[PDB]
Amino acid sequence: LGANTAAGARNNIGAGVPATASRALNGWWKDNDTGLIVQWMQVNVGDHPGGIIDRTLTFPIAFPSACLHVVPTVKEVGRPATSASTVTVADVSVSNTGCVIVSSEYYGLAQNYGIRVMAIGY
């Protein structure tokens, strides 16, 4: 083993450490080798009223240093008049604690949509 400590042992045999996770609907996974954190979350919104709608989403845990990337998509909660695919999204701002997602619609009927976000950071 060439050492008397766990850290020294792993370094000498080139081993990594276990990842950790919260395996929840709004959850996260952390690589404890590099510190990278991946998170995923969702929020149910309801109908899109038209125009431009901003919504703040809070990550399951805060990134300790930075959020590097977000991946926003649309979920359908129900189909009252038309499908949630008539709503589209883009990210407005990204922070260590959450993001702002903007949505708009291209069909003016009632939806029941939600927003999903996957995020990468550390």
Added chain:
Amino acid sequence: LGANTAAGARNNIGAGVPATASRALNGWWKDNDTGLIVQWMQVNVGDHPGGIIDRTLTFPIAFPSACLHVVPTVKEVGRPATSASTVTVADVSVSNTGCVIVSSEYYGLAQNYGIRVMAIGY
């Protein structure tokens, strides 16, 4: 090492286990520390005929317990009259075995689109 078993050895030096994967177009990666599984897949559809279209997608492998998150996006297979970016998607339902993705179009010309999904679960 402080133990006579591989599991006990790793616990004593704080080491994790190797991830496994199928590095395929429709593939998966599994963290065998936490059990988290990430999958990715695609299906070629063709033209969007208008209206609302639901399609069932089957994951490369079933999640043993639950799918936590899906990330659906649109791929362009070809460009017969207009681009596949005129088709948009949302997820309708998510299970341990697959998902239903709904699509609609905002330009009524011929596309050749497909659906991509990335999924997280365990």
Added chain:
Amino acid sequence: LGANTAAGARNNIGAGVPATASRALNGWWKDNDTGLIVQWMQVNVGDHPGGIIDRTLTFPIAFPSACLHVVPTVKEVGRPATSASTVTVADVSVSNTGCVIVSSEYYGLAQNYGIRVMAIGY
């Protein structure tokens, strides 16, 4: 330990190796057990002029063998007249070095959009 080499030691106790990463805005993470690489990137574009727009994006690093999956989404850089959610995207082609993303708009006002891509490969 049952061996005199680091690789043999890890095999005998069933330990994996540390992942590596570039924790940058345009960055990557590599599982050195399976070789899977995840990358993320963004590019600011500006206004969508209408019609169909193709753009080539270059991955932070080349995948040594193949890109298996891409996840393109839209970011809002600013809001000059309307939101970037009125622009939508699809992937046209994917290679070991990058991808081509096609975009179109469903509202003919000025945007300031960018393109985000998450990619999986090895």
